[PDB]
């Protein structure tokens, strides 16, 4: 329901080459990361960030929508920099937490764990599957 039948689809062209529509979780090359529900009563939920800076809890404009006891109106909150997606905790003394660690902010990574209130989520990226180089030491 984000977009009204209106113009939608146009009539019937044959021709067109489409490629994102109903699942963009392909490579979604556009700076966008999405959140999987990993354990909880809704597993396979997703939830798309369309960049700049996403709240959670709220039911107004935001992509992250629990219905729950738990979870306050923004008990967690997202923010883009230099590219790069982040976290931070508005609740007091204890909160929101990376890798089972209280902080006042860190920034997410593809491969990431993100555990909410009672919900458990994992940050994930659309990577390129390119070069597998990163860091480790094979050598003494």
Known sequence: VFRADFLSELDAPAQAGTESAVSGVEGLPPGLALL????????????????????????????????????????????????????????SLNGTYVNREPVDSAVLANGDEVQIGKFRLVFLTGHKQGEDLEHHHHHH
Do not use: M, W
């Open 36 to 91: 999987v529900v990993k354990r909880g009563p809704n597993a396979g939920s997703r939830f798309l960030l369309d960049q700049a800076i996403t709240s959670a809890g709220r039911h107004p404009d935001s992509d992250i929508f629990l219905d729950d006891v738990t979870v306050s109106r923004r008990h967690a909150e997202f923010r883009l920099e230099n590219n790069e997606f982040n976290v931070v905790d508005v609740g």
